[model samples]
Target: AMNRIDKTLEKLKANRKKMLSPYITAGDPYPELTVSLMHQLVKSGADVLELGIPFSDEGPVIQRAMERALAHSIHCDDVLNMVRQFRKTDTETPVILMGYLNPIEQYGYDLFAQQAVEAGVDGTILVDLPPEEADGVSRVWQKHGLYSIYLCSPTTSAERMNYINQHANGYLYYVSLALKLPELKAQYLQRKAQSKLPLMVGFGIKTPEMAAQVAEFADGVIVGAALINEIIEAYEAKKDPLQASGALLSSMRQAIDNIGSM
Candidate 1:
């Protein structure tokens, strides 16, 4: 049987190009929409889906945003349920959850892992957990066959990079630049070259040109803020959300495909 990480890598290689994983806030505009969005995303060229889990205590600013969008935000159980529903119909594209650990802890790690496996989630991206602390959780996830992806920034030294590479499964998430949602910087290539695992770059990747450039060094490119911008634009213009999502995915994938040719 293929491990979760191996399956994900196989899918990327089969695409004949670096994979494109899109992140979207589950229940952003509405909860029910996520199911449809998942379908549309895969149809539009998404190899993997990064589902965002909202936490009520995600710092003051983020907490406020969640509170304001509380009516639209789906709870962890609801989101997991949706994952289960999607899994029944689709198995080719992997689904990974990205969020803080507090919510998962509140749900109990063992139970969380069990439900996640049942929901067809292949892995997770816990934003704040360091590798040392991750061992316990990682072991739990590994037991249940889930990948625990680790993140590396440009600030990570060679020693740390090796350590992260050794522990990271699925793919090493290389954050572009130092700031949050900042523009993709050239420095990312330097850091990516230092890592051993398949490098997946995120942050500041907003355009096909930028995506293509990053794909030159990394195994995959993840776009979040830019895609969110497209969704917002579609909502403002009263245009169909699926059309907007298709436009963004097509442009980004085309750029990555162009890079693969070279």
Candidate 2:
């Protein structure tokens, strides 16, 4: 049986649709709200949910989110437990953990992978783990049927890119400012031709327009800091954070769908 990540991507590709993957900091603002937020995100437009595990080498918005979560005593265990809670009602939306590797190392890769599978997590983007250092961990992930999503940039060396192409499963995440779409597009095209895996562009995609532009070429568009900022503002304003983020994501979904139609 295919993992949810693979199945979702395959379905979208076959249907000529782009993926809308929203990244959120789990346990942000309040721990109890995380699972509900996951459901709300899916209802709005998210095909895949990238949940941050409250640790950061991220932008200020995500940093603040992680800080707030940490203040609430949110840890790796709490994040995984939240995923367990989320899987109870919504089992279709793929959930991927986006975080650093230290906690996983502390928890041991085998144990963390086993627990994440049990909790219904489909994959992970361990931002700081180099592919060279992930041989053992990748095997552990494969053993548990967990996907290892790797990040790439336009300037990534050919050697490293080749290594990633061979090792990373599920997809390759292209992170950039989306400032040079022409250049990035060329690079993405070249990489897409070279690698057999699906390419998901993220990190600097903030608006529907940006997402639409990337969706024209990329297999998936991921929104992170912008989505988190929307949630944070809504929470501070005493508005419904879930509704606010949902509105933002639905617009992106519309834009991406429009691109598919064109």
Index of the highest-lDDT prediction: 2
- Identify the runs in model 2 with alpha carbons over 4 angstroms from their true place: 260-262
Candidate 2: residue pairs that collide: none
Positional deviation of residue 235's Cα in model 1 after best superposition, in angstroms: 1.8
Model 1 earns a TM-score of 0.87
**How many residue-pair clashes does candidate 1 contain?**
0
lDDT of 2 by residue, 114-211 (tens): 99999999999988888778888889999999999988876777888888888788888887632577887888887777666888888678898989
Off by over 4 Å in 1: 57-69, 177-186, 260-262
**TM-score for each model:** 0.87, 0.95
Which pairs, if any, clash in model 1? none
Least well predicted 10-residue stretch by lDDT in candidate 1: 176-185
